[PDB]
Amino acid sequence: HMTLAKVFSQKLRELGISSIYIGHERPSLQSLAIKMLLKNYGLVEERREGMLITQDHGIKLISGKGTETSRYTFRKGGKKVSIHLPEYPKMVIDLGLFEFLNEEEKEKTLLQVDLCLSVIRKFLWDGNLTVVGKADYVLGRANIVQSLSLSDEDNPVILDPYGDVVATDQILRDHNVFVIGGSFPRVKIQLRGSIIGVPDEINKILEIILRVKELDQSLEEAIISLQSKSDKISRLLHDVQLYGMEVLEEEARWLRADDKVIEIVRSRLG
Numbered sequence: 001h002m003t004l005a006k007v008f009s010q011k012l013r014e015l016g017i018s019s020i021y022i023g024h025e026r027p028s029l030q031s032l033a034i035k036m037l038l039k040n041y042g043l044v045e046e047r048r049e050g051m052l053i054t055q056d057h058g059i060k061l062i063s064g065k066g067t068e069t070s071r072y073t074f075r076k077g078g079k080k081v082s083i084h085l086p087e088y089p090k091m092v093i094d095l096g097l098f099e100f101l102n103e104e105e106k107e108k109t110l111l112q113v114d115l116c117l118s119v120i121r122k123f124l125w126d127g128n129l130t131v132v133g134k135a136d137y138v139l140g141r142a143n144i145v146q147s148l149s150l151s152d153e154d155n156p157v158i159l160d161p162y163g164d165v166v167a168t169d170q171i172l173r174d175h176n177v178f179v180i181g182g183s184f185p186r187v188k189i190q191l192r193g194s195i196i197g198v199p200d201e202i203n204k205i206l207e208i209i210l211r212v213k214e215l216d217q218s219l220e221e222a223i224i225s226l227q228s229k230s231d232k233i234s235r236l237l238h239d240v241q242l243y244g245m246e247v248l249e250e251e252a253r254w255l256r257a258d259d260k261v262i263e264i265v266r267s268r269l270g
């Protein structure tokens with residue numbers, strides 16, 4: 001779809017603005033826009049000089065002292081830019097069954113939901129995240145609702161590792177609402193025919209989907225980038241039981257698996 005950084009940059013050019021003095025802020029449009037949306041930060045109209053730090057989506061981000069010309073500086077208290085924030089995608093986490101679980105289980109689930117905020121703010125913004133079915137929960141500007149209300153422009157899918165619809169670049173790309181649990185299609189992410197090795201963690205699933213949608217990355221590469229040592233180990237082990245040792249070496253270069261992983265997988269066999 002569109003990242004917050006991209007929408008921000010298109011509005012900025014329209015007005016006529018292609019340089020910002022950022023002073024002491026992380027020099028990324030995403031970060032700057034998030035900050036503007038969440039704090040009293042904004043743009044102040046002032047003429048300043050600097051050197052380039054970067055050229056994000058075509059906008060010269062300035063600081064320090066040099067010879068690059070800013071007409072606008074990003075400052076605590078400046079004026080907001082007004083940007084049609086992307087309605088989509090909407091990432092929904094369902095906490096319906098939440099009080100089936102153990103105390104220790106609830107603390108793990110919620111820690112995982114907490115980390116979603118950081119993922120959502122890496123591409124979109126808090127508004128694109130919704131949590132359903134727990135009303136005392138508060139996660140920055142996430143929507144916190146008791147039940148999910150569907151609109152005509154919503155085209156949703158349920159992420160379910162026991163689903164009957166295998167996920168695909170196109171299927172993730174052609175949908176815009178995604179429900180991840182604590183009557184639409186129930187969609188299962190596999191690695192290469194299998195669910196084994198696929199990260200289990202709510203915040204990792206969410207990040208896999210966004211990588212595919214916002215960065216134009218493949219599902220395979222997305223999954224692999226987000227695996228833990230344990231995901232790789234468990235998958236190599238499985239596949240060596242299946243296909244034998246000839247598989248090990250090459251399937252480790254593909255899983256991008258490091259020495260420690262391969263060491264361990266050897267050590268389990270002999």
Ligand SMILES: Nc1ncnc2c1ncn2[C@@H]1O[C@H](CSCC[C@H](N)C(=O)O)[C@@H](O)[C@H]1O
Nearest residue numbers: 159160161180181182187188189198200205
């Ligand atoms: N490989 C995968 N494919 C699709 N969805 C997944 C997935 N791994 C995790 N999820 C999502 O992450 C949530 C937490 S995993 C626990 C749910 C598990 N299906 C169960 O029945 O116990 C799941 O409900 C699912 O929404």
